[PDB]
Design a protein around this ligand. Structure first.
Ligand code: AMP
Ligand code: AMP
Ligand code: AMP
Ligand code: AMP
Ligand code: AHG
Ligand code: AHG
Ligand code: AHG
Ligand code: AHG
Ligand code: TL
Ligand code: TL
Ligand code: TL
Ligand code: TL
Ligand code: TL
Ligand code: TL
Ligand code: TL
Ligand code: TL
Ligand code: TL
Ligand code: TL
Ligand code: TL
Ligand code: TL
Lengths: 317, 317, 317, 317
């Protein structure tokens, strides 16, 4: 007895008495992720080096095409696209999908873990689809998750029911359910942030970090880890517990991370796992977007760790 | 045209006029790395999950076995073994290999990049091979390098004539020379260290770090990155420039990283790439070891960055 | 735009307003076939040869387990099993599946193309499931098909709507629809039969062969091909046209091929493609089975070729 | 322990004391075979089918390119090329290679086993390399063998010291020695020939065939098998015993199969395996060719079977 993503999605669509439109969608995503995973591990590179005689771009095209061919979407928002993609009326479904095809594109050359981030909305309204359909607060997410191309490829899927992790057996091209109903640690022992911006941190952030390296109660300090790819850092947080942070600074007073296809998908996964995701002031999932490429600060992770910072945030208010 | 590791290695052994003993060794190694990469990527995991009909220990066995059968080694030192392994008189060769089968094994469950590290010495004290044979300064390395199981698998090989990077094409199980004679930037813009140990850093490290976040002449501060996997952090240093540091601290008064199978191979690769690798007080490669599992502090990366920290070390002494 | 087996099955289940029980079934079969294909191409053989220190049986277990875990079947009949497998009431569905996990097992050692054969029945009755549910004339098949592990792996699926061929892209573990609504040639130019039994053929068969090598109308003779694996011979017939024959002789007066899991699945595929499948006397699909391992003679292929023999059969009646 | 083609080849070159030139050649060949196997198995086909972003010609290019780059060849003869290819003075070596990149190309669309055939001669007439250099009797072969892309990929290598079979483990892209010093059964029980040419067979062939179906002393008749792919039929002959025949007929008065890249390599493998390979009148290996694309009749297989047919040939003359 083994559960595959294909089996799982189908049983879940069945319990929910769906028309089967969203199952077609989740199955198209699984296929797109397997195709990207293969391109990322460099299968076929020899041909490129003349054996017989871009990666973000290939990833964008794969997701966009595999999604359109699902006949389940009406609007697609990608980090690589200035405007939202409105689906041809022939292949139009009722879902709006926001995604980042290959996050951590800067790390590609250094071979660091990279990933794909997606969020699915049910179109709410009754008129010609447009960007406006994508502009829904994260709280309205039907499903969200990510695929991490690291030492192994894993798909983490979060829906109203919970968070489940699927490992890719590359030998048979099938995702195996390896961890179900995942809940994050109440309090972790690792903090993640680019301290190279110390000079730009607000006093609350500055204070938290200080408390982590030099514990006022003389407890053990927190270990530091900052991979440089959100999916890798967040995935480690989900699994090992701790806190990830990318607050505003000179690097945009609005933070660097995008709201629709990065912050929201990850906040949704986080909340479903039993942790928190805040901007320091408000819950990420409650922000009403104004633009499809709107950035937003984010702090996420174990509840006890995110609350501790939230307090320091209040103190300096 | 297309250059494969196999062709490159043979061609080099020919120019060198070797008896083909080292070529067999390097060919065995390459085979062991493709086997580990496959296990690491979780090929066949569906069988553990009951479709019907560890990873560090498995890696150790692969390396040990594939190397013994090469008939080119007499002494083996693994991070996984307390004692040095002495090869059977029947399979003995003239080479001594020091290796870390799967480095970054804490990052396994979090799916972060991990790797294999190897250093190769030639037994010169023709006596019954013993532990003593491995106790040579890194300055005596014949060959050294590593395999990084990241977003893609890469094998970095360093020898007297240079450093060359080989990318694995998993479709045909062949390593392709993607980069020839690799040389690191003189000065980088990323520092890598576990700042969670800030409370235990010597004044030289402490000063250098603060100088990176708050530059005297108001220049751009360095970005921070610390994956937590030496092979991954060092590969980023090699490819993009910067400095990696794992200094001595209370928990590790002599550092954490081992001399023979971690510090030395990375120091050797760094030097051949045109960079520096220091203890803070002396060059890693000149240290004559006393214990096979001896630890050593290490700082490596671009020459201009490593020098700057070396000056601060001189200033506080 | 590309159609995958997963997409295809889902859209077909949707058009048919099914509960989704048969889709779960066809999806479990696709997974089983990918797992068998991988075992057949010998991935992981190195471990068997001690790199770090039955095939029909593995195939039986894979199909049986993957099928039971679909929760869509009540009775399974396998060539490798003396008795029919009655599903645990926990995982009991309404379908009866007859299959040959790995046909051409004798050819394994010689590396000749081998395959899997399956036929799906809807249980008809309302009582405790038993072998008796498998004993339905082939005419009652819901779906049937085969997977051929040859130079490439292909799944041919036949349902009331028609016959469609899916090629396995082993890189992404997905079956791609490469040929839809396949129809066989009216008259082919190849005959397939083990002529080593010439001494045992009845006069009609003897006469047909003679007419093929020495055309009475002085037309070009037919080419001969007999791989030795039914799936390969039949698949070539479907694609290139011609006739395949395995009539009775000293090798059982009932022929060698089994009725439920070999003859029927292939006759069903054949008829749906627009060809014929006969025992010489009657249509294979109309035989009422008496035993689950009942053998039956079979002649199949292009209509004009099968009719020509049928006439010679009548002449000697 | 585990023996890989790479290790085996190097070890043999060492014992032979070669300059490593032939080893490079055999290593290049092995690389070309893994590349063809992958293309043959349809890895990446989903890209032709619009997931968004020949086979014989491709095989030809792979072989030609991978061989030229080995710097070990001066003349190449392909079934795909009218003229013999003369390697650039810059990449020239001392070896001449005669090959059939993808044999059985008619069986491609039917997914039947196909393969690559190669014969290697040493240029002895040290003159500007020309077509003349390839025109050597097979008796002068340095090495010969084939790659069979069947249910699994296998590489059969024959040299002065014997025939060895290597199975490809596609997971790690390594060929494993599965069978050492292969020797064919003295007498088999399967005959292989296209009986659709019965109307054009000489009396010797005609008599031998009828003697196989109707044995004088009532013994068991031989089974018939004719895949239609030489590499596949000959591999079965090699592994299981028997006889393969492609005699001269009206359509092919001198036979169909080519001498240099089909008959010779298979004749060489047969002789080293302890079998016979005849034209009916003379040994295939002793024929001194006049044309690079010269055809020749061929009969090979177990010694006892081939002799029996040779006697019948003597009787009718
Ligand atoms: N595979 C699924 N898993 C969980 N819920 C689903 C699935 N498919 C559909 N649903 C649910 O039923 C609603 C409508 O489904 P649908 O008719 O497929 O568009 C969805 O938006 C979810 O609430
Ligand atoms: N493939 C090779 N590449 C570069 N140098 C080699 C190679 N093989 C052997 N050598 C060198 O020649 C020495 C003796 O080689 P060997 O006879 O193979 O033991 C080595 O220790 C190196 O100095
Ligand atoms: N994927 C499918 N493709 C074609 N027909 C299907 C599919 N699934 C179900 N059906 C049909 O609907 C009937 C009952 O389906 P089910 O409720 O899934 O058991 C089947 O027996 C077929 O007639
Ligand atoms: N790997 C090998 N295995 C067996 N014999 C070899 C090998 N390499 C070279 N030889 C032999 O030694 C001769 C010259 O080799 P070479 O110097 O490599 O050109 C060959 O033609 C064969 O006789
Ligand atoms: O994909 P991008 O645009 O290259 O950025 C990735 C993001 O970049 C962040 C890191 O940026 P900093 O260097 O500023 O820390 C990660 O947290 C996210 O993956
Ligand atoms: O394989 P190990 O014993 O788990 O250690 C890996 C090493 O551990 C260092 C990081 O450890 P810290 O958490 O102490 O920084 C890395 O740079 C090296 O990969
Ligand atoms: O799987 P099996 O039991 O080995 O047999 C396979 C069948 O065996 C038939 C051939 O048998 P003959 O040798 O008698 O022709 C093929 O047509 C079928 O694949
Ligand atoms: O590659 P080709 O030109 O298609 O030919 C393959 C050969 O063709 C012979 C069979 O041809 P016949 O149909 O004439 O028997 C085989 O034994 C050899 O593989
Ligand atoms: Tl991106
Ligand atoms: Tl991004
Ligand atoms: Tl971003
Ligand atoms: Tl380790
Ligand atoms: Tl380590
Ligand atoms: Tl260590
Ligand atoms: Tl069987
Ligand atoms: Tl069978
Ligand atoms: Tl059978
Ligand atoms: Tl050909
Ligand atoms: Tl050919
Ligand atoms: Tl030919």
């Amino acid at each position: 007895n083994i559960v595959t993503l294909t089996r799982f999605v189908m049983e879940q669509g069945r319990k929910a008495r769906g028309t089967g439109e969203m199952t077609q969608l989740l199955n198209s995503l699984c296929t797109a992720v397997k195709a990207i995973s293969t391109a990322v591990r460099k299968a076929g590179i020899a041909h490129l080096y003349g054996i017989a005689g871009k990666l973000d771009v290939l990833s964008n095209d794969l997701v966009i095409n595999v999604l359109k061919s699902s006949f389940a979407t009406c609007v697609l928002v990608t980090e690589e696209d200035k405007n939202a993609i409105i689906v041809e009326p022939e292949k139009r479904g009722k879902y709006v999908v926001c995604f980042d095809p290959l996050d951590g594109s800067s790390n590609i050359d250094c071979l660091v873990s990279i990933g794909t981030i997606f969020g699915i909305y049910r179109k709410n309204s009754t008129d010609e689809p447009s960007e406006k359909d994508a502009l829904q607060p994260g709280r309205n997410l039907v499903a969200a998750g990510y695929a991490l191309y690291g030492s192994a490829t894993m798909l983490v899927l979060a829906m109203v029911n919970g968070v489940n992790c699927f490992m890719l057996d590359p030998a048979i091209g099938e995702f195996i359910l390896v961890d179900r109903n995942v809940k994050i640690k109440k309090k972790g022992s690792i903090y993640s942030i680019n301290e190279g911006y110390a000079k730009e941190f607000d006093p609350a952030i500055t204070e938290y970090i200080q408390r982590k390296k030099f514990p006022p109660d003389n407890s053990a300090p927190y270990g530091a880890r900052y991979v440089g790819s959100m999916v890798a850092d967040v995935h480690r947080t989900l699994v090992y517990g701790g806190i990830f942070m990318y607050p505003a600074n000179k690097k945009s007073p609005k933070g660097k991370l995008r709201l629709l296809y990065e912050c929201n998908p990850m906040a949704y996964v986080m909340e479903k796992a039993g942790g928190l995701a805040t901007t320091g002031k408000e819950a990420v999932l409650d922000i009403v977007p104004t633009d499809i490429h709107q950035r937003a600060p984010i702090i996420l992770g174990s509840p006890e760790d995110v609350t501790e910072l939230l307090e320091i945030y209040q103190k300096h208010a």
